[PDB]
Write an enzyme that holds these catalytic residues in place. Structure first.
Site, PDB file in Angstrom:
ATOM      1  CG  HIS A 113      -1.750  -1.357   1.226  1.00 34.64           C
ATOM      2  ND1 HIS A 113      -2.850  -1.621   0.442  1.00 34.64           N
ATOM      3  CD2 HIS A 113      -1.537  -2.475   1.963  1.00 34.64           C
ATOM      4  CE1 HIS A 113      -3.298  -2.838   0.702  1.00 34.64           C
ATOM      5  NE2 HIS A 113      -2.507  -3.382   1.607  1.00 34.64           N
ATOM      6  CD  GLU A 159      -1.614 -10.261   4.444  1.00 38.77           C
ATOM      7  OE1 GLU A 159      -1.452  -9.266   5.171  1.00 38.77           O
ATOM      8  OE2 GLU A 159      -2.228 -10.188   3.360  1.00 38.77           O
ATOM      9  CD  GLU A 179      -2.222  -3.501   5.048  1.00 39.78           C
ATOM     10  OE1 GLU A 179      -3.478  -3.458   5.039  1.00 39.78           O
ATOM     11  OE2 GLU A 179      -1.566  -4.318   4.364  1.00 39.78           O
TER      12      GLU A 179
HETATM   13 ZN   LIG Z   1      -2.349  -5.246   2.615  1.00 34.26          ZN
END
Ligand SMILES: [Zn+2]
Length: 186
Positions: free
Chosen positions: A12, A148, A28
């Site tokens: 991102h 993640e 995030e």
């Molecule tokens: Zn992500």
């Protein structure tokens, strides 16, 4: 020459905030960059390692562009850094590592080595490794994983993710997993 190039992709950026904490309005994108910066700094200290990052600041980069940057950098390994999210929940915990569908190039091996090493360093719930068709993994030309790094949607996980000592441990775990892969399968 005998250097390995590690391409680090903080997920991102810019207009793409990624998941947003419901507790604290942290994004995030920002936490990804923090974790990636620690990972990049640690890798760059290793002798035979050159680090390339998709971004160092709060910049928007498309998925297509990340794979292009990785490919043009002729990286040996790609590590994308993201945080997980439950679409309808706030309880999930732990770390999992993704690799491209049916990977035969060593991505699966890289994923398992990094995942297992992370588990030893931060001692988080081991969600294992997962095939995923995420474009950055799919369209990159070298062994590629996406980690993640915990569920930003779960308040307990968020308290870890924001913590600098936790980010440091996680980054160290990732470094050792990458080095262990590269030492054996460059
Ligand atoms: Zn992500």
């Amino acid at each position: 020459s005998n250097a390995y190039t590690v391409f680090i992709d903080p997920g991102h950026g810019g207009n793409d905030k990624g998941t947003e904490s419901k507790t604290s309005n942290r994004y995030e994108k920002d936490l990804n960059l923090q974790i990636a910066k620690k990972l990049a700094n640690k890798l760059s200290k290793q002798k035979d390692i050159q680090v390339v990052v998709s971004r160092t600041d709060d910049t928007y980069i498309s998925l297509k562009d990340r794979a292009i940057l990785a490919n043009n950098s002729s990286a040996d390994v790609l590590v994308s850094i993201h945080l997980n999210a439950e679409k309808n929940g706030n309880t999930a915990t732990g770390i999992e590592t993704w690799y491209r569908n049916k990977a035969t190039d060593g991505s699966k091996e890289l994923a398992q080595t990094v995942q297992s090493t992370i588990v030893s360093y931060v001692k988080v719930r081991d969600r294992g490794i997962v095939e995923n068709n995420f474009e950055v993994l799919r369209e990159s030309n070298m062994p590629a994983i996406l980690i993640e790094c915990g569920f930003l949607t779960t308040p307990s996980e968020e308290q870890k993710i924001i913590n600098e000592k936790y980010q440091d441990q996680l980054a160290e775990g990732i470094v050792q997993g990458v080095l262990s892969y590269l030492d054996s399968k460059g």
